[PDB]
Design a protein around this ligand. Structure first.
Ligand SMILES: OC[C@H]1O[C@@H](O[C@H]2[C@H](O)[C@H](O)[C@H](O[C@H]3[C@H](O)[C@H](O)[C@H](O[C@H]4[C@H](O)[C@H](O)[C@H](O[C@H]5[C@H](O)[C@H](O)[C@H](O)O[C@@H]5CO)O[C@@H]4CO)O[C@@H]3CO)O[C@@H]2CO)[C@@H](O)[C@@H](O)[C@@H]1O
Ligand SMILES: OC[C@H]1O[C@@H](O[C@H]2[C@H](O)[C@H](O)[C@H](O[C@H]3[C@H](O)[C@H](O)[C@H](O[C@H]4[C@H](O)[C@H](O)[C@H](O)O[C@@H]4CO)O[C@@H]3CO)O[C@@H]2CO)[C@@H](O)[C@@H](O)[C@@H]1O
Ligand SMILES: OC[C@H]1O[C@@H](O)[C@@H](O)[C@@H](O)[C@@H]1O
Length: 368
């Protein structure tokens, strides 16, 4: 009945402005958490993680799905998509996890494809071939969105994670496509495959589809750094409406809330990083802005609870600590994550400018 909405600059549940406080699961098994009957293996862990999330007083978990095509989606011999997975179980798994997350009053952000790295030749061609992308939409995505759109706790689909990881930086007259600066900033660290035009086209079309199947659905993109989603500081905001729509005429092919990832390189913030500024200077009040991904290990050592508090105080609509499974570089431990989540526990400060309601009470389905 009531689903998380995005209005103006804020998230809203049941009218009450909400602040997304939680963690990245990102995964239990990289790229094989759902689909091909793999959910039987990872499921218990993920559910338990949702438990920890709620007990620590959080409301959101960010979970990756397709990732690098290891299970999702199913391609044929020609690189066209046939189904969600070979065993056709993906939708059931996701649906299940959504049910549990709801039962524990936790929202989920389903990240479709990875973009930091994408070493799958079929997924890589989804950016270039329109018919293959359409095959993915028709045979995989549209069924997923259609089947899962009646689920609260499904608060947003993220089309692409860090599209700058596999960006091919280059010059272009069109503001949106030009990437002249990003090369020196360290973009394309996963290999320079996709020019900005192709990424914006892809995202355009994915988001378009998701919204065609689900008018309410919140679509987003989670970027490496802030250099990509703000017009201030001489930077550029590529994933706003005009640019996306500019790449592939889908008017509704737009994200509904921006998102920035941030880490300290050498223990030094980027000068204009989310924690050295506030939401407001990024001049993106037309949509909400979430800080998906941050780690109190790759910060300036402000303190984890101090980082959550910073996010809640300086206008940001959410803050997600980086990976709950405690693995990789620049990742907090699940314990310290829990600790930080306890900083905004049971909080509700709807006095504007401040984060808002944290502990949300989510519905079930209406059906019929
Ligand atoms: O890197 C330095 C160099 O980069 C240059 O930019 C390159 C870029 O790096 C990529 O290599 C890119 O490669 C893509 C091609 O441009 C082209 O789009 C190609 O087309 C594919 C298509 O995506 C799809 O997969 C298609 O499916 C076929 C299928 O295989 C089967 O045959 C079936 O019967 O038909 C379907 C058709 O629907 O197969 C096509 C094969 O051609 O996809 C490539 C992806 O690797 O090219 C860029 C150049 O435009 C330049 O910037 C250069 O300046 C720079 O120095
Ligand atoms: O999201 C974290 C993720 O980052 C990955 O790759 C990048 C990283 O994101 C970041 O962009 C980094 O940028 C470097 C850049 O490559 C140059 O070395 C740059 O230089 C600057 C120089 O030091 C001087 O200050 C000069 O004045 O200005 C130059 C910039 O014009 O320094 C940047 C430091 O921020 O590069 C890495 C890799 O290229 C991976 O690290 C990944 O593992 C990580 O999780
Ligand atoms: O560091 C953890 C990793 O998380 C991923 O989501 C991307 O942000 C990568 O760039 C990063 O290396």
């Amino acid at each position: 009945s009531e689903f998380l909405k995005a209005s103006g600059s804020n998230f809203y549940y049941g009218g009450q402005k909400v602040f997304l406080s939680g963690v990245n699961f990102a995964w239990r098994s990289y790229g094989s958490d759902f689909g091909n009957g793999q959910y039987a293996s990872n499921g218990p862990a993920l559910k338990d993680w949702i438990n920890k999330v709620k007990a620590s007083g959080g409301n959101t978990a960010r979970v990756w799905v397709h990732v690098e095509g290891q299970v999702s989606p199913a391609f044929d011999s020609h690189g066209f998509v046939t189904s969600t997975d070979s065993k056709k179980t993906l939708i059931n798994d996701l649906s299940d996890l959504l049910d549990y997350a709801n039962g524990q009053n936790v929202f989920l952000i389903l990240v479709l494809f990875n973009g930091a790295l994408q070493n799958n030749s079929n997924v890589q061609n989804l950016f270039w071939d329109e018919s293959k992308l359409n095959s993915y939409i028709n045979n995989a995505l549209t069924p997923m969105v259609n089947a899962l759109k009646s689920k609260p706790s499904l608060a947003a689909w993220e089309v692409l994670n860090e599209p700058e990881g596999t960006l091919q930086p280059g010059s272009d007259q069109n503001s949106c496509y030009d990437t002249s600066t990003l090369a020196a900033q360290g973009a394309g660290w996963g290999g320079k495959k996709f020019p900005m035009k192709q990424i914006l086209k892809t995202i355009n079309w994915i988001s378009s589809a998701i919204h065609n199947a689900d008018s309410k659905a919140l679509v987003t993109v989670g970027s490496w750094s802030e250099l990509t989603q703000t017009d201030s500081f001489g930077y550029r905001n590529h994933y706003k409406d005009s640019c996306l729509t500019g790449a592939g005429g889908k008017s509704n092919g737009i994200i509904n809330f921006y998102q920035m990832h941030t880490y300290s390189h050498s223990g030094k913030w980027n000068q204009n990083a989310p924690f050295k500024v506030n939401r407001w200077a990024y001049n993106v009040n037309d949509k909400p802005l979430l800080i998906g991904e941050f780690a109190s290990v790759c910060s300036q050592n402000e303190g984890i609870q101090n980082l959550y508090k910073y996010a809640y105080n300086n206008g940001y609509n959410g803050a997600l600590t980086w990976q709950f499974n405690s693995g990789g570089d620049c990742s907090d431990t699940y314990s310290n994550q829990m600790y930080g989540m306890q900083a905004l526990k049971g909080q509700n400060d709807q006095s504007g400018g401040k984060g808002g309601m944290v502990s949300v009470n989510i519905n079930h389905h209406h059906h019929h």
